[PDB]
């Protein structure tokens with residue numbers, strides 16, 4: 001009925017004429033995601049990636065790798081003997097490591113504002129899992145299990161070579177031995193490993209059993225929206241090798257006049273960039289390649305130069321500056337000085353009058369991201385702000401740094417799957433253009449001054 | 450490089466200066482969705498609903514119910530004897546009915562522009578399914594299977610009472626007998642019913658096995674984006690009883706001046722509507738109720754009147770009229786006569802300059818819809834165009850009629866799950882307001898006139 005619009009987010013909230021003594025209060029249950037499976041099954045991989053996605057879409061998440069807790073308690077690794085079921089002392093340390101991790105999980109979900117906590121450990125026994133349930137139960141946390149099952153020696157072998165042997169545990173080992181020691185380590189967990197059994201013992205557990213690297217899934221009783229998304233997400237990511245290329249439209253006319261937004265076409269240099277891009281793609285010699293653009297003339301003209309089928313996406317359109325479209329930063333500061341200042345102090349959440357915020361872009365780009373995960377080779381020709389959002393997702397950058405990532409014109413960012421994330425390579429196509437990057441940039445409201 | 454922007458959709462396409470003799474060409478493989486399971490398992494329900502969703506998001510889909518083909522070939526039903534495995538003649542008719550349906554499936558996917566075809570029949574035998582694969586294989590159609598398994602007599606019994614007994618097959622029967630005849634009919638299919646076996650015989654088939662009304666899922670090798678969505682969709686819909694209420698913000702100031710868009714607050718009547726709405730909600734006496742609004746002041750003020758926690762969604766914001774925001778239809782016709790005319794001849798695809806189209810709303814509302822499916826009781830306070838889109842989804846209205854659906858101010862649309870769809874009830878809260886509904890509305894370009 002009677003409200004006021006927040007200055008940064010432009011959100012309508014009710015005016016709280018806090019009486020004499022303003023009462024605050026503060027601070028949807030948090031979720032503990034429990035990874036399950038033998039080592040070298042991709043649990044850490046899934047953990048890190050899922051967390052990357054969730055934080056990007058706005059759900060604060062953190063991974064709690066029990067392994068790191070162990071490396072912290074036991075300075076240097078020696079061999080798999082540490083993991084033998086008969087190693088009574090090591091068992092105490094391992095148990096202590098897991099409980100210490102949960103301790104931090106409690107502090108995260110109950111005292112640091114986190115919503116999701118990924119408990120990354122083998123958690124291969126009903127006994128370990130029951131303990132976690134109890135823990136969750138007493139702290140009022142929902143529990144969701146993700147088990148990875150893979151009995152393909154080629155896969156396990158490969159997984160070991162990609163992330164295991166180069167672990168700090170094997171700092172003083174050659175491939176031959178690290179590989180041999182890890183295999184023995186896995187054997188240690190095999191005897192008491194009790195996979196999840198939803199059609200029986202684990203009927204009441206909320207879980208997803210990822211089988212044969214995503215070939216098949218077994219989902220049991222999803223509880224909420226959050227558990228709905230993850231499941232959706234896990235069923236769309238793959239591990240096939242491929243490359244993702246990201247770049248902006250060749251320089252446009254508004255770029256030259258320092259004008260934001262609009263729908264201007266390519267400048268002579270922008271067109272030059274287009275051919276260069278065509279040459280670059282040709283040289284990459286990719287068997288197949290999808291090309292995506294926004295619906296703004298700028299990106300489509302660039303795509304045309306490629307002579308390849310491309311698909312337009314309205315979601316890739318540049319951020320909408322509202323009443324500031326087509327205006328220069330100078331004109332914005334002069335006409336909307338307060339709006340200008342507000343954006344500089346909170347560039348991620350700031351929303352343009354009748355326009356958008358970087359936050360809006362993320363919600364808007366979520367489906368572009370979901371498709372990128374499903375695809376193989378893809379070239380995305382877009383815009384500065386948009387590019388920053390996608391890049392933030394792939395490179396796991398925070399919301400605070402997202403609106404400042406450097407995404408120059410005429411430059412292609414080549415992204416490749418490496419280890420637990422994405423490797424990025426920058427390739428400038430050698431065509432001049434303007435630079436549209438802008439970095440971040442009291443006494444009277446106090447006595448004495 | 451050199452393109453032109455389409456007048457209606459504002460989409461940048463390359464100029465095709467069709468040479469002397471313009472060549473056209475024309476017209477992603479189509480998909481045949483194969484339903485599997487004993488009768489009264491919700492296959493038709495799933496079929497119709499999935500098709501409702503798909504067409505709404507833009508993927509042309511149609512259901513091919515073999516049952517209707519049979520009722521068409523055999524004027525009147527008599528009893529389950531028709532379905533006995535020893536009824537050699539009926540078997541010929543049934544086979545003929547299925548093949549006739551596929552025939553229409555071919556014509557749909559290959560000659561009518563359809564993308565998805567839902568083959569709705571029990572398809573309970575490996576033999577029937579293998580036939581469908583062959584069919585698909587020879588027409589270059591992908592094949593996806595959805596099997597519904599339910600061994601809960603209470604469920605089957607209930608399903609029978611809700612959609613079976615009231616079938617035209619039982620026009621001359623009382624509940625007692627229709628129920629008894631249907632049970633015998635189901636027995637007929639039980640002997641040769643071979644459920645899907647993904648971990649064996651059906652390993653290479655793309656399928657999802659819905660178990661215990663969604664309690665559990667078994668997904669096997671999703672092939673594309675399309676099979677990704679459906680799966681996601683099926684895992685989010687439920688059949689619990691609940692109600693969805695939809696209405697617009699109480700009348701606002703711009704409403705009074707005949708002004709579109711903007712972010713004006715409630716008028717005195719709009720506020721009156723707010724209290725009325727509060728009274729209405731109270732009288733509905735719902736155990737729980739979620740309230741959703743847009744981020745425009747109008748809907749939030751309305752929600753405030755309820756004194757209930759509500760969640761804002763940027764996706765629910767009214768359609769964006771671009772450079773026409775805050776303008777009157779009169780001012781639009783006068784200032785942008787051509788834009789005005791263009792919108793009237795293609796109201797669904799038309800996009801406002803630097804604004805949106807009803808088509809954009811759908812893509813934008815997809816996640817609102819997905820959440821509505823996951824929830825129980827929900828009150829959505831929004832806007833005319835937005836409301837029309839949601840209503841179009843629930844009432845299965847076409848894109849052509851969506852921008853004209855009647856969604857008056859101060860009126861609540863109560864939606865309830867009934868049969869295979871949604872029942873709608875309109876409740877006007879008895880508070881005056883303006884009417885913002887607008888219906889649809891050569892010689893010189895020819896010789897002689």
Ligand SMILES: Nc1ncnc2c1ncn2[C@@H]1O[C@H](COP(=O)(O)OP(=O)(O)O)[C@@H](O)[C@H]1O
Pocket residue numbers: 037038039040041042043044045046148149150155158159160162163164210212213214239419
């Ligand atoms: N669902 C999966 N099944 C098997 N291997 C996978 C899966 N997802 C990812 N991987 C692979 O596993 C490796 C990462 O394994 P890691 O996460 O360290 O295993 P773990 O934590 O289970 O000991 C990568 O090479 C990755 O490609």
Ligand SMILES: Nc1ncnc2c1ncn2[C@@H]1O[C@H](COP(=O)(O)OP(=O)(O)O)[C@@H](O)[C@H]1O
Pocket residue numbers: 486487488489490491492493494495597598599604607608609611612613659661662663688868
């Ligand atoms: N996954 C499901 N399992 C069991 N019953 C369901 C499911 N989905 C919907 N239903 C119920 O089934 C009924 C509709 O059944 P119908 O589609 O005619 O069955 P069928 O086509 O299998 O003979 C409705 O009462 C609906 O609530």
Ligand SMILES: O=P(O)(O)OC[C@H]1O[C@@](CO)(OP(=O)(O)O)[C@@H](O)[C@@H]1O
Pocket residue numbers: 039044065066067068070094098120121122123124185
């Ligand atoms: O509590 P458990 O089940 O042992 O799981 C965590 C353990 O797994 C290890 C299994 O090798 O994996 P990780 O690679 O995740 O570090 C150990 O470091 C750690 O002790």
Ligand SMILES: O=P(O)(O)OC[C@H]1O[C@@](CO)(OP(=O)(O)O)[C@@H](O)[C@@H]1O
Pocket residue numbers: 488493514515516517519543547569570571572573634
């Ligand atoms: O080809 P089949 O496997 O018999 O499936 C379609 C058949 O199922 C029926 C099963 O009762 O169901 P429906 O309610 O879908 O009409 C019959 O009308 C029809 O003959």
Ligand SMILES: O=P(O)(O)OC[C@H]1O[C@](O)(CO)[C@@H](O)[C@@H]1O
Pocket residue numbers: 259260261262318319321383384385403436438
């Ligand atoms: O996020 P920033 O640093 O304000 O830059 C935003 C601008 O970048 C551009 O893509 C190019 O200036 C504009 O269209 C957009 O308004």
Ligand SMILES: O=P(O)(O)OC[C@H]1O[C@](O)(CO)[C@@H](O)[C@@H]1O
Pocket residue numbers: 708709710711767768770832833834852885887
């Ligand atoms: O779809 P229509 O019939 O053009 O009406 C659209 C308009 O409806 C409103 O919600 C009210 O006029 C406007 O904000 C919006 O522009």
